[PDB]
Amino acid sequence: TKSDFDMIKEKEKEALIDQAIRTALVENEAKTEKLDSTPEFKAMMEAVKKQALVEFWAKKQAEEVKKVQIPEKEMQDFYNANKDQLFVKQEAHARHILVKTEDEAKRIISEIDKQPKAKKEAKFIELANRDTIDPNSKNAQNGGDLGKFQKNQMAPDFSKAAFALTPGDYTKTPVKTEFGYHIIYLISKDSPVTYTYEQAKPTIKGMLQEKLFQERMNQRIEELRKHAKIV
Amino acid sequence: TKSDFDMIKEKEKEALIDQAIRTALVENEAKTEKLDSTPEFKAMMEAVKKQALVEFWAKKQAEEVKKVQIPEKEMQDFYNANKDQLFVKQEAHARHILVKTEDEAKRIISEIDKQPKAKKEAKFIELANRDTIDPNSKNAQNGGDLGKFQKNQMAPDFSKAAFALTPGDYTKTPVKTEFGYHIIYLISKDSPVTYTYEQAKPTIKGMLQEKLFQERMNQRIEELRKHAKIVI
Ligand SMILES: O=C(O)c1cc2ccccc2[nH]1
Ligand SMILES: O=C(O)c1cc2ccccc2[nH]1
């Protein structure tokens, strides 16, 4: 149906057409008022245009990369070289305590060292509630509990230390993070299980295509630079 | 600085200009490749422009509305007619049970009814883990626990019944909501405090200005309808 000039294509259908009509009426009025000729409007339209030109070009390059056949050896070599970083699933449960100075940390660790086995985690819980400067933990008073997490979910040096422990054990030397020094207690830790090559393969193809696509974009962009007047 | 013809408008800045340059290069190339001449691109631009026309029109109406001073008696009559519904602060802690059909709810309530008070809430908790159709509640298995909430956060019919209970008491007849039928147990409930007009003033003005802005859009749109050739 038609609102003045503009074209639009059960009983609910009518209500929809009513909304469409109202919208066309506002569009027409906005054009009549020349709101698309305000600088703000023009600026916004060109930002959108630039963004969309860049994204369509990207899609074009991606569609050309998706055509390239990735060799089996390249996916198997990627699997062998990156499985232990990318395809091992291992959930840990741990508590931590964060402090300002490596000395404070050392003293806390000393306070745990002297506990009987039965009282180790309780002591840790108490020291976390008393001394942590992790604001989340300090506020929750949950004994420095981090819940369950993967190695690729915490900062690398924290994750390494946590996963290197065996359950029931804590770090005997403080751990350096930018937030300060951590003492970590491991409650539990699953045995690592790696995804098999056949299970990782589609993911691997996608990661190698992503790699080709980014290299291709950077190659193309450098060719465009060498043929452009930049000042 | 300038990329071919295109124009661009200390170490973060360097990276910024570089990234901007790369983007201009891509924009120019996309133009060279005539990606802006495809049906898809023109369609997208047309949609974005239409949307933005409507938004700028609205924004304009809002800018004209914000100039209007809302009369004091309007805000005071708003306050007086709507204070007990909108401006009472009352925090509650309660447990609830949602069911599809009223009969299930009644059986559940009777199941609580046959319990001594000391085992009533444990019974409520079991019943909540078993028969609730709140998926959040069903998944947490926390006994229909809702934490703390204000009186203006729940469905009206929920809040009236939950807030009419005394602490430790539960609803003796199920409560009708669109999600089904409810049974409520009241753990805690603060004493109601109604906000003063002086405290309600800034929030109220924002509500009444909103009321006008929506009324003003409808008024104008209806006039726009009478001066247009609509054909169906
Ligand atoms: O900001 C903090 O307190 C904090 C950092 C951090 C890093 C890894 C694990 C736990 C953590 N907590
Ligand atoms: O959708 C639901 O299950 C649900 C409705 C509702 C109303 C008040 C309090 C809690 C509630 N939960």
Side-chain angles (χ1 to χ4, degrees):
Chain A
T1 66
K2 299 180 185 188
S3 173
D4 260 337
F5 22 67
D6 221 301
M7 292 169 135
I8 315 165
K9 288 164 54 196
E10 299 87 333
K11 186 190 62 58
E12 298 170 333
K13 303 187 171 186
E14 281 176 317
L16 277 184
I17 270 64
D18 297 335
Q19 168 185 336
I21 284 184
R22 299 169 49 85
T23 295
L25 286 172
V26 171
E27 290 169 13
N28 295 335
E29 176 63 16
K31 274 162 179 171
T32 296
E33 291 173 34
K34 292 274 171 280
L35 304 180
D36 59 329
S37 297
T38 67
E40 312 158 301
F41 198 102
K42 297 229 281 292
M44 83 127 290
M45 285 302 144
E46 278 282 336
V48 170
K49 192 188 180 181
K50 181 165 55 144
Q51 225 171 6
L53 282 173
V54 172
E55 283 164 26
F56 274 73
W57 182 80
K59 285 203 279 193
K60 191 85 157 158
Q61 309 305 305
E63 274 305 313
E64 291 172 22
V65 160
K66 282 180 179 302
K67 293 196 233 184
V68 191
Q69 312 277 5
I70 315 183
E72 196 81 8
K73 190 191 189 297
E74 182 171 347
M75 306 170 74
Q76 295 187 233
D77 287 333
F78 182 97
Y79 179 81
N80 294 334
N82 309 116
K83 55 175 294 177
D84 286 334
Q85 283 79 17
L86 300 188
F87 301 109
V88 33
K89 200 140 176 213
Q90 210 191 359
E91 196 196 44
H93 189 186
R95 323 193 76 112
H96 90 303
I97 305 177
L98 171 79
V99 286
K100 191 59 158 167
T101 79
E102 173 164 355
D103 182 50
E104 292 164 290
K106 275 173 189 165
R107 288 177 64 199
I108 283 163
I109 297 173
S110 179
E111 199 67 11
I112 306 165
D113 285 325
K114 65 185 197 181
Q115 302 310 323
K117 189 170 174 53
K119 294 186 183 177
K120 259 158 43 189
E121 195 184 355
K123 200 76 202 185
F124 195 99
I125 286 168
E126 163 187 358
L127 288 170
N129 294 333
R130 193 178 191 92
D131 302 330
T132 204
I133 69 179
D134 176 0
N136 305 324
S137 291
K138 181 67 177 186
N139 182 260
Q141 296 279 294
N142 58 357
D145 201 9
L146 293 159
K148 302 168 185 169
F149 62 83
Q150 309 284 321
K151 172 185 169 298
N152 287 320
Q153 271 189 327
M154 297 287 144
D157 306 338
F158 184 93
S159 281
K160 310 302 189 176
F163 280 88
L165 301 160
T166 61
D169 217 19
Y170 55 101
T171 51
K172 305 294 185 286
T173 83
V175 177
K176 62 284 107 183
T177 203
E178 63 278 21
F179 311 106
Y181 294 111
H182 283 132
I183 306 92
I184 302 170
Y185 180 101
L186 189 73
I187 302 165
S188 74
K189 176 182 70 179
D190 295 8
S191 58
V193 194
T194 29
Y195 286 96
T196 73
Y197 172 75
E198 278 299 327
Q199 301 177 316
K201 191 186 178 183
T203 307
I204 293 171
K205 197 182 177 175
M207 296 177 171
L208 294 171
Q209 281 174 331
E210 174 68 15
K211 175 184 165 68
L212 277 173
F213 165 67
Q214 285 289 341
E215 288 167 355
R216 186 200 184 87
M217 277 195 307
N218 297 335
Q219 286 163 14
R220 296 311 162 261
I221 288 176
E222 277 304 319
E223 299 303 304
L224 300 173
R225 192 190 297 276
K226 294 175 299 192
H227 297 103
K229 266 186 164 162
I230 316 185
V231 163
Chain B
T1 65
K2 298 180 185 186
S3 172
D4 262 339
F5 35 31
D6 237 85
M7 295 169 136
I8 303 166
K9 286 158 51 198
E10 298 89 330
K11 187 184 64 60
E12 297 172 334
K13 302 189 171 187
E14 283 173 317
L16 280 183
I17 274 65
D18 296 335
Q19 171 184 337
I21 288 184
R22 300 168 49 83
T23 298
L25 290 171
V26 169
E27 192 188 4
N28 298 338
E29 176 63 19
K31 272 165 178 172
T32 296
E33 290 172 32
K34 294 273 175 280
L35 302 178
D36 58 329
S37 298
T38 64
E40 313 156 300
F41 193 101
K42 289 179 184 301
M44 160 201 297
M45 291 319 290
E46 279 283 334
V48 172
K49 191 186 180 180
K50 280 182 166 96
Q51 224 170 4
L53 282 173
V54 173
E55 288 163 29
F56 275 76
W57 184 81
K59 189 47 71 179
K60 173 171 180 177
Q61 308 306 307
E63 275 306 314
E64 293 173 22
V65 165
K66 281 180 178 302
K67 315 245 257 56
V68 192
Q69 304 276 5
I70 324 183
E72 194 79 7
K73 194 189 190 297
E74 178 174 346
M75 306 171 70
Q76 298 193 238
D77 287 333
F78 174 87
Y79 177 81
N80 294 337
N82 299 284
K83 50 177 294 175
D84 287 335
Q85 289 80 18
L86 292 63
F87 299 117
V88 185
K89 191 261 171 282
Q90 211 188 358
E91 191 197 40
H93 194 18
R95 322 196 71 115
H96 90 303
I97 289 179
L98 179 53
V99 153
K100 212 59 156 169
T101 79
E102 172 164 355
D103 188 50
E104 292 162 286
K106 270 176 185 166
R107 291 180 66 200
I108 279 164
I109 294 176
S110 181
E111 198 70 12
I112 315 166
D113 279 322
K114 66 180 193 181
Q115 304 292 155
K117 191 169 172 52
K119 290 190 179 179
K120 262 164 42 187
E121 198 189 357
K123 203 75 202 182
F124 199 100
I125 296 167
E126 158 184 356
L127 277 36
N129 294 334
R130 198 177 193 90
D131 301 332
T132 202
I133 72 177
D134 177 5
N136 304 326
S137 285
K138 184 72 180 186
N139 182 258
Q141 294 274 292
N142 55 350
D145 194 12
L146 294 160
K148 301 166 187 168
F149 60 77
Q150 312 290 322
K151 198 185 177 303
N152 283 326
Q153 268 187 325
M154 317 276 89
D157 307 340
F158 182 91
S159 282
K160 311 303 188 178
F163 280 89
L165 297 161
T166 69
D169 221 18
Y170 59 101
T171 53
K172 302 294 181 286
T173 78
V175 177
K176 297 195 278 175
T177 196
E178 63 276 19
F179 311 102
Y181 292 77
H182 280 135
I183 304 128
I184 308 168
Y185 181 99
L186 189 71
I187 305 168
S188 77
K189 179 187 73 176
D190 291 12
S191 58
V193 187
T194 148
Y195 287 99
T196 72
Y197 177 78
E198 283 304 328
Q199 296 178 310
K201 189 187 177 183
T203 304
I204 287 175
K205 201 179 178 174
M207 294 179 170
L208 294 173
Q209 280 175 331
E210 179 68 14
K211 192 194 177 190
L212 273 172
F213 165 67
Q214 284 288 339
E215 285 170 354
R216 189 199 186 86
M217 283 173 83
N218 298 334
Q219 286 162 15
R220 295 311 163 262
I221 291 175
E222 284 308 320
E223 302 304 304
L224 259 37
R225 198 193 296 275
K226 293 180 301 191
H227 303 105
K229 266 183 164 160
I230 315 184
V231 165
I232 302 168

